[PDB]
Amino acid sequence: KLQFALPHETLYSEVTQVNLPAKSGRIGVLANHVPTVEQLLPGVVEVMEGSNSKKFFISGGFATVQPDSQLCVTAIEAPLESFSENIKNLLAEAKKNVSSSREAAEAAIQVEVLENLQSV
Amino acid sequence: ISYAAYLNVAAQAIRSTELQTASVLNRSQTDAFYTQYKNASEPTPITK
Amino acid sequence: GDRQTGKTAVALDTILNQKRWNNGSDESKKLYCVYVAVGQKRSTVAQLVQTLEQHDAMKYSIIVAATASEAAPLQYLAPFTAASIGEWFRDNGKHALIVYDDLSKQAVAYRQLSLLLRRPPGREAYPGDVFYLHSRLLERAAKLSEKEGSGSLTALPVIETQGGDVSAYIPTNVISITDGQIFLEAELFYKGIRPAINVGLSVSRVGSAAQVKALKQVAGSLKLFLAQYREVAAFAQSDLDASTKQTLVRGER
Amino acid sequence: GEWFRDNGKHALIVYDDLSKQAVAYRQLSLLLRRPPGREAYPGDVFYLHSRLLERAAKLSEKEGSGSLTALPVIETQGGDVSAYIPTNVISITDGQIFLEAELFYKGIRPAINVGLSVSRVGSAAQVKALKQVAGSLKLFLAQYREVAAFAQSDLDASTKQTLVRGER
Amino acid sequence: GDRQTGKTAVALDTILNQKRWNNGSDESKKLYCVYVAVGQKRSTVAQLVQTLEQHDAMKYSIIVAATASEAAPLQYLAPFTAASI
Amino acid sequence: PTNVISITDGQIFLEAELFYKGIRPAINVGLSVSRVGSAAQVKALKQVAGSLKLFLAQYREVAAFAQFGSDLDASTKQTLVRGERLTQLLKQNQYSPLATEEQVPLIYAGVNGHLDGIELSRIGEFESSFLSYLKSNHNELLTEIREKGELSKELLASLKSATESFVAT
Amino acid sequence: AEYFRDEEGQDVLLFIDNIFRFTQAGSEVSALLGRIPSAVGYQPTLATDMGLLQERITTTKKGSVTSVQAVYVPADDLTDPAPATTFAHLDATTVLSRGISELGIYPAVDPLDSKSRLLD
Amino acid sequence: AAVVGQEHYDVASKVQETLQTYKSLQDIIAILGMDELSEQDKLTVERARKIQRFLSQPFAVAEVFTGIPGKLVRLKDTVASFKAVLEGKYDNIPEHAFYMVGGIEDVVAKAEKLAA
Amino acid sequence: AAVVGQEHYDVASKVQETLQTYKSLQDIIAILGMDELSEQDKLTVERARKIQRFLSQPFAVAEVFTGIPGKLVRLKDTVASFKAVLEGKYDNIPEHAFYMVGGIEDVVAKAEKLAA
Amino acid sequence: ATLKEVEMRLKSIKNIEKITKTMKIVASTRLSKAEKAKISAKKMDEAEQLFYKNAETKNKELIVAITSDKGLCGSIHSQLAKAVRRHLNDQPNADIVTIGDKIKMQLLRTHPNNIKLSINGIGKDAPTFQESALIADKLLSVMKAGTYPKISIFYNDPVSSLSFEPSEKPIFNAKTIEQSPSFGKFEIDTDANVPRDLFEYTLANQMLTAMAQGYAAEISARRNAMDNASKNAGDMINRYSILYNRTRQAVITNELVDIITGASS
C-alpha cells in the first residue's frame, strides 16, 4: 500500500511498483521491503499501479516503508507534464543570483531543480 | 539553511510551467514578521 | 401580568380550590369568594359563570358583574359596590375573599368618568385622584382583630400590564397599595409553563406565617434555590463546572 | 380639476405640498378656538385631508370615462414617517414614493428608495411593453438590496454575480 | 448639569479662589462676589455661610438669599433684587 | 434649559456620569464651550494650553474606538496613552482651588508630554510633588510666571528645562 | 346583521373593514364634540364606545352574529391604546401573511401566527 | 473627605469608580461575549461583579418575609471589609459567596459553606 | 449644473459622493476596522479623509481665535484645487497638510513644511 | 429628548445588528475554505505520524503556541492562553515562542519572561507550507531548537463543529529520534544523518499541521462567536423596541396634556 500526501494535495494517500529517488540513489518498493526511512531528494518519481505508470515530479521529502507494508511518501509539491521552459529562463536569473550572495545556496538548489527538470 | 528550508527553496522553484493555477501562486506568497523578544525587551521585527 | 396571559385562570383556580374545606362544617374554614368582573364582555362573564357551575362551585360564591357593555359610571362604581357585598361576610366574622378582575379596567372606567367631568388630565392622562381611587377600594381588605370578630377579606386584585412592563402609572400605583405582587410573565406563559408564575418578580410581603407549618418546613429555602436556578441559567448562556451542572439539573427538574 | 374630469379629458393634479396645507388648517382652527386635538393639529384633520384626496378617481364608462390622477407631496420632517400629519396622509393615499435623503446625497437623483416605495395599483399601469421587459428589473434589484451589505471580501461567485449586475 | 452633581460646588470654588486677588491692595483687580441663592433650603444656605466663613471668604461676599420657605413672590423678585445689589 | 442656553454666552456643561467616573469637578469638555473664548484667557495660560483642547478632542474619539475592542495601531495608542494622562491631570480636590501661577506649570508639563512617561496611578502624586519641587528649586520660575503673566521665550525655555529636571523625579 | 340573527335564526357573519378606522373615526367625533382628549390621543369615551360596537355581536339563543374584523395596528405597535382596546374584544386572530402566500400556499393563513381563544 | 475620614473617603471613592466602570461596560457585556473585554477591564468587571453582590445585607426585620436570618454590620467593620475586597485580598472565592451575606468574615465562612 | 457651470458641477458632485460614501463606511470602520475594507474602499477612506479636512480654512477674524493668517481663495481656484485632490494628484501629500490651508498651492506648501 | 435619545440609540442598536449579521455570513464563507485546507493538512500529518507511531518514538523546554493576529474570535485567544499558563507552571524555565499577536499579548501579561521569539502576520491567511517552513527555519536558527530536551507545540484542536479545545503535542527532539525504542529496521542510512535531518523535517511538518488545525479552529470559533453575537443583538433590538414604543406613546400623551391645559384656561 502507498500513501502519498502533500501539504496541498492527497495523491495515492495496494500500489504495484513505486520508484522513488532518495539520498541513497534510487529505491524501488514492491510488496514488503526493508522498513527503512530514507530522505527523498528533489526528484522525478514514478508510481505504477498494475502496468500503468504515472510520473510525478516531487520536491523531495521523506519516504518511509513502514513495517506493515505502507509506503508513506510526504513531499511539498508536484504531475510531471504540468511542471513543464520559463524555468529555463529562470535559471539564468538564478545564475546571476549565485554571484551576489544564502542566495548562493538557494540558487544552487535552483541549478539542481532545472537540471532535474531538463533531465526529464 | 535548515532541512525544511532546503526543501522550501526547491518547492518555490517548482512553482515556476506558467500554466499553473492562482492557488499555487498564492501558496508561494507569504507575509510575516519575526519579532524577536528577550527577557520584555523587543529586538526589531523583520520580514521572513 | 401581561394581557391575556389568561390571568383570570390563576385566580379562578383559587376560587375552585376552596371547596374541599368550603363544603365542610367548620365555620373557620369557609372562604366564601366574591368575583367582581369589571370590564369584561357579557359573553366572557357568562362563560365564567357556566364554568363555576360546572365545577359545582357556584353555590359558594357570589358574582358581581359590570360588563363591557354597561355604561361607564356603572363600571366605576362596580368594585366599590362589590366590596360592600364582601363586608357583610367580614363583619360577621365569616372568613371571605374577593378577587377583583381586573382593576386595571376600573382605572379606564374612572378615566372616562373624570374626563367627562372636565377634571384636569393627570400624569399619563389618568385622573389626578386615581391613586385615591384604588387606595380607598383596596385598603378595605383586612383581617379583623379578636375584638372585632376575627373576620377576614383576602383581596387579590388583577392588574393587566400593557406591554408587560411593570413600571407605568396605573400599574405602579396599584403595586404600591397592594401587599406583595404575583407577577406572571409572558415569556414563560408562551414557553409552556402554566401557571406562568415568574419567581423573580413574585414576592409576598405578607409573611411566610401565612402558609401552614408543614408547607413551610418542606418548602424551606426552595424560593432561594429557584432564584439560584435563575442565576445559574442566567450566565449558563460559559464553562459549566459540576457545581453549576448539579444546580442546573436540580433546577430544571 | 373637476372641469377636466367631468368633461371627460384626463388630468393630473399634483398637490404640492399637503404638509403645508395641514399647517394652514391648524392656523385657522386654533385661531377660531375650535377644540385642539392630537399634536395640536385641528381635530378633524384626518377628515380634511381625506376629503381632498378622494376627489381623485377614474370615472366609469357610464360616466364618460374621465380621470383625475392626483399626486400629493408630503414633506417628512426629519424623515419621521410616524408623525401625525404624515401618518394620516399615508393611510389616505393609495401608494407611496419615498424619496430618501441619503440616496440623494449618494448621487442617485431621482432618489426613489426602491425598497420603501410601493405601488398599490401597480400592474394595471405600466405600458404593456415596459411591463414585459422590467418584471425582471424589480426582482434583480431586490436581490441587490439584500446582498448589499455583503459588499464589505471573500465572497461567493454567486454573490459576486449579483453585485456586478446590481451595481450596474 | 444634572441635579445633585454638586453644581453649587463648582461655583463655590470660584468664590473661594477670588481670595487671592481680593486680599491684595490692587483695587481694580479685586472681584467682590454676590452669591444669590434662590430656592435652597435654610439649612443649605446656612451651610454655605458656614463654609464661606470657615474659608474666611465671607468678608468680601454678599449673600442674597430667599430660601424656599419664603413666599413665591419674594422668590421671583429675588434674582432681580440681587441684580440691583 | 433651552431658553437659558440661548441667552447665555457659554455653557460649562457638567455631567453626572463623569462625576462617578472619577472626574471632579466633572466638566464634560465636549459639551462645554466659551463663545467669548480665549480673549479672556490668561496670556501665559493660553500659550501652555494651546493644543490641550485638540488633544482632549482626539482623546474622545480614540477612546470610543478602543472600547469596541478593535485593534489599535501605534498612532492610535499614542493618542490613547497621552489622553489618559490628561484626564488624571484635570482632577482636583473639591473646595481647594489652585493658584493660576501654579497652574501654568502643571498644564505645561502635560501638554509638552512630560507626563506621558509617568505611570497612570501616580499621576496625581506627580502633580502634588511637582508643585513642591517648583516651590523648592524653581521658585524664580514661579515668581516670573505670576509677575509677567505671559511666558517669554526665555521663560519657556527655563520652564522647559525645569519640567525636564522633575521628569527624573 | 342583527335582523338576520334575531328574526331569521341563521348564524350570520358580519365583516367590518378596518376596525382601526372605527376607532380612528371615533377619535374625531369625540374631539369635535369638545370632550377633553384622552391618553395617546384617543376618545375619552374610548373603552365604552368600543364596547357598544363590540358587545352587540354575541351568541344569542336564536342565532349568532360572528364578525371577522380587520385590525390595522397603528405605527406597528401592539402597545398603542387603540390596538389594545381592540385586542380585548378579539377571540381568535387569523394572521394572513404575505410571506406565506409567497411560499405558494394559498389560503395565505400563516400556520404559526394564528391563535384562537377557543382552541383549549 | 475627612468628614467620614480620609480612609473612609478613599474606600468609597474606589467603590464608586469600580462600580461605574462596570456600568459603563454594560453595553459591551451584552452585545459581545464577556470574554471579548480587554484583559485589564476583565479584571475590573470580575472585581465589580463581586462588589455588587457584596452590597447585599440580609434584612433583619424582614427576616420573616425574606427567609435569610438578619445581619447588621458595624460601620468601622464596613470600611475595613470593602477595603480588602477592593485590594483583591479575598477575591478568589466564588461569586455566589458574596451574595446575601453579612460582614467580610461572613463571606469567608460562606466560602467554607460553598466548598462543602 | 447649468447655473454654476458644468466643470464646477462635476467637481462638486464628485466631492459630495466621496464624502457621503465615507460617512456610510464610518460604521464599518468603527467596529470591524479597516481590515475587511477593499482596496477601493481603502483608497476612498484615504481620499475622503483628505477631502474632509481640506474644508477647514483659517479665517481673517480667526486670527484672534487661532492666529494662522486668514485665507480667501478665488471661486475658480476652489474648483481647481478640489478637482486635483479628487483626481488623486495630491494623494501623496500627508494628511495634516490639508488642515487649515487655502488652495492646492497652499497644500503643497504645507507638504514642504511637514517635510522639514 | 426621551424620544430622540431613545430613537438614536435604537438606530445604533439596529446598525450593530446589521454588522453582526454581515460578519456572521462572511465568516461562514471563509470557514468553508478553512475547513478544506485543514482536511488536507491533517491527511498529510497522519503519514508523518505513521513513522513516529510505528517507531514508538516516546520522548530548558520550548513551548510554541498558535493563534491569529485577529481578535474577537470568541475565546480561542483566552482558552489557549489558559492552557499555556497551566503548562507554564509545570516547567518554570521554558522559553515560549508565540506565533500570533493574540497569544503574544495574553501570554506577555501572565509572565513577561516567556517571550523570546514571536511572529506577526500569520493569522490572516490560510496555513501554507511556505509560512511553516520559514517559521521553522527561523525556529532552528534563532532559538537553537535542538538544544531543548522537550519541544511542545500548543494549538487549538477544532474538536467538534461547535467546539475547540486547546491541545498540545510534543515534537520529538533529534536525540529522541536517535534513541527511539524501536529504531529497528527503520533507517538504513548511517551516512546521511537521518535523525538530524528527520528532526528538522518533522519540526516543520508537525508545525504546519498545528498551524492548520489552529486556523480552522480560529475561523470556526469566529463563526460561532459572530452567530451568538447576532442572537444577543437581536435580544437587544427587541428590548429597546419595547422601550422605543413606550417612549413614543409617552411623548404623544405628554404633549397632548400641554395643549389641553392651554385650551382649558
Curated annotation (Swiss-Prot), chain B:
PANTHER family membership: ATP SYNTHASE EPSILON CHAIN, MITOCHONDRIAL, ATP SYNTHASE SUBUNIT EPSILON, MITOCHONDRIAL
Alphabetically ordered keywords of this record: ATP synthesis, CF(1), Hydrogen ion transport, Ion transport, Membrane, Mitochondrion, Mitochondrion inner membrane, Phosphoprotein, Transport
Name used for this protein in its record: ATP synthase subunit epsilon, mitochondrial
UniProt main location, coarse: mitochondrion
Disulfide bonds: none
Source organism, top-level taxon: Eukaryota
Gene3D superfamilies: ATP synthase, F1 complex, epsilon subunit superfamily, mitochondrial
InterPro entries associated with the record: ATP_synth_F1_esu_mt, ATP_synth_F1_esu_sf_mt
Phosphoprotein found in the keyword field: yes
Entry function: Mitochondrial membrane ATP synthase (F(1)F(0) ATP synthase or Complex V) produces ATP from ADP in the presence of a proton gradient across the membrane which is generated by electron transport complexes of the respiratory chain. F-type ATPases consist of two structural domains, F(1) - containing the extramembraneous catalytic core, and F(0) - containing the membrane proton channel, linked together by a central stalk and a peripheral stalk. During catalysis, ATP synthesis in the catalytic domain of F(1) is coupled via a rotary mechanism of the central stalk subunits to proton translocation.
A Pfam family this chain is assigned to: ATP-synt_Eps
Curated annotation (Swiss-Prot), chain C:
UniProt site (Required for activity): 202
Location in the cell: Mitochondrion inner membrane
Binding site for ATP: 1-8
Role, per record: Mitochondrial membrane ATP synthase (F(1)F(0) ATP synthase or Complex V) produces ATP from ADP in the presence of a proton gradient across the membrane which is generated by electron transport complexes of the respiratory chain. F-type ATPases consist of two structural domains, F(1) - containing the extramembraneous catalytic core, and F(0) - containing the membrane proton channel, linked together by a central stalk and a peripheral stalk. During catalysis, ATP synthesis in the catalytic domain of F(1) is coupled via a rotary mechanism of the central stalk subunits to proton translocation.
Stated family: Belongs to the ATPase alpha/beta chains family.
Quaternary state and interactors: F-type ATPases have 2 components, CF(1) - the catalytic core - and CF(0) - the membrane proton channel. CF(1) has five subunits: alpha(3), beta(3), gamma(1), delta(1), epsilon(1). CF(0) has three main subunits: a, b and c.
Other comment: Present with 41500 molecules/cell in log phase SD medium.
Protein name according to UniProt: ATP synthase subunit alpha, mitochondrial
Organism: Saccharomyces cerevisiae (strain ATCC 204508 / S288c) (Baker's yeast)
Curated annotation (Swiss-Prot), chains H, I:
Keyword Transcription regulation part of the UniProt annotation: no
GO molecular function, one term: proton-transporting ATPase activity, rotational mechanism
One GO term of the biological process aspect: proton motive force-driven mitochondrial ATP synthesis
Protein's cellular compartments: Mitochondrion; Mitochondrion inner membrane
GO annotations of cellular component type: cytosol; mitochondrial inner membrane; mitochondrial intermembrane space; mitochondrion; proton-transporting ATP synthase complex
Keywords annotated in UniProt: ATP synthesis, ATP-binding, CF(1), Hydrogen ion transport, Ion transport, Membrane, Mitochondrion, Mitochondrion inner membrane, Nucleotide-binding, Phosphoprotein, Transit peptide, Translocase, Transport
Disulfide bonds: none
Note: Present with 164000 molecules/cell in log phase SD medium.
Sequence similarity: Belongs to the ATPase alpha/beta chains family.
Assembly and binders: F-type ATPases have 2 components, CF(1) - the catalytic core - and CF(0) - the membrane proton channel. CF(1) has five subunits: alpha(3), beta(3), gamma(1), delta(1), epsilon(1). CF(0) has three main subunits: a, b and c.
Record protein name field: ATP synthase subunit beta, mitochondrial
Species name: Saccharomyces cerevisiae (strain ATCC 204508 / S288c) (Baker's yeast)
GN (gene name): ATP2
From Swiss-Prot, chain J:
Effect ascribed to mutating residue 259 to T: In ATP3-1; dominant suppressor of the slow-growth phenotype of yme1 strains lacking mitochondrial DNA
Key word Transit peptide present: yes
CDD domains: F1-ATPase_gamma (cd12151)
Principal place of residence: mitochondrion
Example GO BP: proton motive force-driven ATP synthesis
InterPro entries in the cross-refs: ATP_synth_F1_ATPase_gsu, ATP_synth_F1_gsu, ATP_synth_F1_gsu_CS
Localization per Swiss-Prot or TrEMBL: Mitochondrion; Mitochondrion inner membrane
Single GO MF descriptor: proton-transporting ATP synthase activity, rotational mechanism
Effect of residue 253 to A: In ATP3-5; dominant suppressor of the slow-growth phenotype of yme1 strains lacking mitochondrial DNA
Keywords: ATP synthesis, CF(1), Hydrogen ion transport, Ion transport, Membrane, Mitochondrion, Mitochondrion inner membrane, Transit peptide, Transport
UniProt cross-references to NCBIfam families, sorted A to Z: ATPsyn_F1gamma (TIGR01146)
Quaternary organization: F-type ATPases have 2 components, CF(1) - the catalytic core - and CF(0) - the membrane proton channel. CF(1) has five subunits: alpha(3), beta(3), gamma(1), delta(1), epsilon(1). CF(0) has three main subunits: a, b and c.
More details: Present with 28100 molecules/cell in log phase SD medium. PubMed:12898710 reports two tandemly repeated copies of ATP3 (ATP3a and ATP3b) on the right arm of chromosome II in several laboratory strains, including S288c. This has not been confirmed by the yeast genome sequencing project.
Recorded family membership: Belongs to the ATPase gamma chain family.
Name recorded for this polypeptide: ATP synthase subunit gamma, mitochondrial
